[PDB]
Amino acid sequence: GSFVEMVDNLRGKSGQGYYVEMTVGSPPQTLNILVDTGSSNFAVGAAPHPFLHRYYQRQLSSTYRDLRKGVYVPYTGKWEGELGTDLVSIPHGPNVTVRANIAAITESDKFFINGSNWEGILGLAYAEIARPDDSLEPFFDSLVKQTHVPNLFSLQLCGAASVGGSMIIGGIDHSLYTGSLWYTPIRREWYYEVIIVRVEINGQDLKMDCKEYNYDKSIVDSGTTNLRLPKKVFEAAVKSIKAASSTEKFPDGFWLGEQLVCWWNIFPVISLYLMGEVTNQSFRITILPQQYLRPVEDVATSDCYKFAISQSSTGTVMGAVIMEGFYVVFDRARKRIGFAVSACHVHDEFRTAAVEGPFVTLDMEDCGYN
Ligand SMILES: C[C@@]1(c2cc(NC(=O)c3cnc(OCF)cn3)ccc2F)C[C@@H](C(F)(F)F)SC(N)=N1
């Protein structure tokens, strides 16, 4: 209900993600760690990459144990490291110390951000996508196995430049949201996979076969900035967003994220309906242009914004563009994810982000890709 010591334990800069302070080893080494519900490894800088403020020094730790195994993790950047275990704690988190797997990062490319204040990543998703395989127990799994911390965590990510928010570990803080929580099932415990059953732009249904909304999956990912949509869905959404915002024209490159525009009510709300807890029942989460038109503050050659909805080949990714609207409860114990209106979300006098239900939606199981 109330975890005041964990409130406001997240920091970041716009476009660089949200991080939490952790300690690794004995005596404790303080590191800032990106909170990532889209991956499953605890991986920290362990060598003096010039972009890093701090890094894990295994030689200074008496509780370090070598697993004598390496791991190589390419993405569409990359990183490589050495697997071990050590004692891990979260200063503005529950009062516990856990022995966790750590990938000591020894080489990387396009992974760390030049100018950011974090030097590792906390993968909070499930073992099935852990590298090199599902035998490497993710951090949160170790946390639950070794303590009486309940098997859930919740995230309030606050946008718009410093950002902040809260990671409530083992519970929910009711001051972080307004109205009620609405829950969608976690379809499979790998990513935080969910099913989208309907899409509306300013209340107008896109009218697509709902399978296309989830081709080939839909996930909830704090480690991605954009709302990413499958190519066909993105196509249809931009078309509809263009129509709704017709009073001004804009170049095609802007909608494709290939150029910024410099200059809210011009733009429509976007609603995703998610599978509910009950047969034939759904609910709707709604975001504003405040969430999906993101300011780009680092423009030396210019008040510019990037269109932060983009096309994807890996499915829908509900990134920061979605999560900044909402308090999001990752209720692992019950295989579900709760959304509520965030008490910190950016909005105006006319429109607010919303979570509403129940709605009647048939054939919701058919929306999943197999
Ligand atoms: C592990 C990986 C990854 C994420 C990031 N994330 C950011 O830099 C970032 C920036 N801003 C954000 O919000 C706005 F503030 C959020 N997150 C960086 C490196 C990285 F490796 C992999 C990423 C993937 F796309 F390569 F798969 S996605 C993914 N889920 N995890």
Swiss-Prot record:
UniProt-listed GO biological process terms:
amyloid fibril formation; amyloid precursor protein catabolic process; amyloid-beta formation; amyloid-beta metabolic process; cellular response to amyloid-beta; cellular response to copper ion; cellular response to manganese ion; detection of mechanical stimulus involved in sensory perception of pain
* Subcellular location field: Cell membrane; Golgi apparatus, trans-Golgi network; Endoplasmic reticulum; Endosome
Return the EC number.
3.4.23.46
Q: Does the keyword Transit peptide apply?
A: no
In what way is its activity controlled? Answer: Inhibited by RTN3 and RTN4.
- What's in the GO CC field? axon; cell surface; dendrite; early endosome; endoplasmic reticulum lumen; endosome; endosome membrane; Golgi apparatus
Stretches in topological domain Extracellular? 1-370
Give the principal location in a single coarse category.
membrane
Tell me the disulfide pairings in this chain.
C158-C344, C210-C367, C262-C304
Tell me what turns on expression of this protein: Up-regulated by the Ca(2+)-regulated transcription factor NFATC4.
Instruction: Give one GO molecular function term.
Output: aspartic-type endopeptidase activity
Entry-listed glycosylation sites = N95, N114, N280
Tell me the membrane topology, using the record's own terms. Answer: Single-pass type I membrane protein
Q: Which family does it belong to?
A: Belongs to the peptidase A1 family.
**Subunit architecture:** Monomer. Interacts with RTN1; RTN2; RTN3 and RTN4; the interaction leads to inhibition of amyloid precursor protein processing. Interacts with SNX6. Interacts with PCSK9. Interacts with NAT8 and NAT8B. Interacts with BIN1. Interacts (via extracellular domain) with ADAM10 (via extracellular domain). Interacts with SORL1; this interaction may affect binding with APP and hence reduce APP cleavage. Interacts with NRDC AND NRG1.
Q: What is known of its domains?
A: DXXLL motif is required for a proper endocytosis and retrograde transport to the trans-Golgi network, as well as for regulation of lysosomal degradation. The transmembrane domain is necessary for its activity. It determines its late Golgi localization and access to its substrate, APP.
- This protein is called Beta-secretase 1
| Species name | Homo sapiens (Human)
